[PDB]
Design a protein around this ligand. Structure first.
Ligand SMILES: [Cl-]
Ligand SMILES: [Cl-]
Ligand SMILES: [Cl-]
Ligand SMILES: [Cl-]
Ligand SMILES: [Cl-]
Ligand SMILES: [Cl-]
Ligand SMILES: [Cl-]
Length: 209
């Protein structure tokens, strides 16, 4: 007595992501969850479902519904080498473009994600476009550990009922929030709303930023 499996089913995932690249599978996602045991396991089932929807909606936004493994515009790749860092860009100046479900970008984020995961992603950032197990964990790392431009982790925003809006702020707040790009804030809210509906939960408060 007591099925406490992942609050998103394979069927629900497939409905959320009809045009996903083969790189991205339900099994890959579920396999990664262990790395972040509080993710989608904290609070009431309403909240767990809401957090799962929040994560996956942002994922969908970053990747075009999991169509893209990596960032398309090669000419902009060198942008992501922050020369001010002391550990530099050893995998190459053009090696730190967006990859995986959260489109992890910048040498400094590869360094931090890698340090957190026990993987040298500064040295081998290509792992995030090659190895789904790593890719998924990079997404969960961002979600569960990083503030980005905001003041709290996406995980804590949902768990503490601070709002979906704060997850947006942590992912691309400096440009999108505070009137920067209301259309794109709304796009994320739309996808989140759809996902909460698929899962049978509510959006919660403070959706915008
Ligand atoms: Cl699948
Ligand atoms: Cl965790
Ligand atoms: Cl989307
Ligand atoms: Cl390629
Ligand atoms: Cl180089
Ligand atoms: Cl791994
Ligand atoms: Cl923008």
């Amino acid at each position: 007595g007591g099925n406490n499996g992942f609050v998103v089913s394979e069927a629900q995932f497939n409905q959320m992501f009809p045009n996903r690249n083969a790189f991205y599978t339900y099994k890959g996602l579920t396999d990664a969850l262990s790395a972040y045991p509080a993710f989608a396991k904290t609070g009431s089932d309403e909240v767990k479902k809401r957090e799962a929807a929040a994560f996956l909606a942002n994922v969908s936004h970053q990747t075009g519904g999991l169509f893209y493994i990596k960032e398309v515009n090669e000419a902009n790749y060198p942008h992501y080498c922050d020369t001010t860092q002391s550990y530099g860009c050893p995998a190459g100046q053009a090696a730190y473009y967006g990859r995986g479900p959260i489109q992890l970008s910048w040498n400094f984020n590869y360094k931090a994600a890698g340090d957190a995961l026990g993987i040298n992603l500064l040295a081998n950032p290509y792992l995030v476009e090659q190895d789904p197990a790593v890719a998924w964990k990079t997404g969960l790392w961002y979600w569960n550990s990083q503030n980005g431009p905001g003041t709290m982790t996406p995980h804590n925003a949902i768990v503490n009922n601070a709002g979906f809006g704060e997850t947006i702020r942590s992912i691309n707040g400096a440009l999108e929030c505070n009137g920067g790009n209301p259309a794109q804030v709304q796009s994320r809210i739309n996808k989140f709303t759809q996902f909460t509906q698929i899962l049978g939960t509510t959006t919660g408060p403070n959706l915008s930023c």
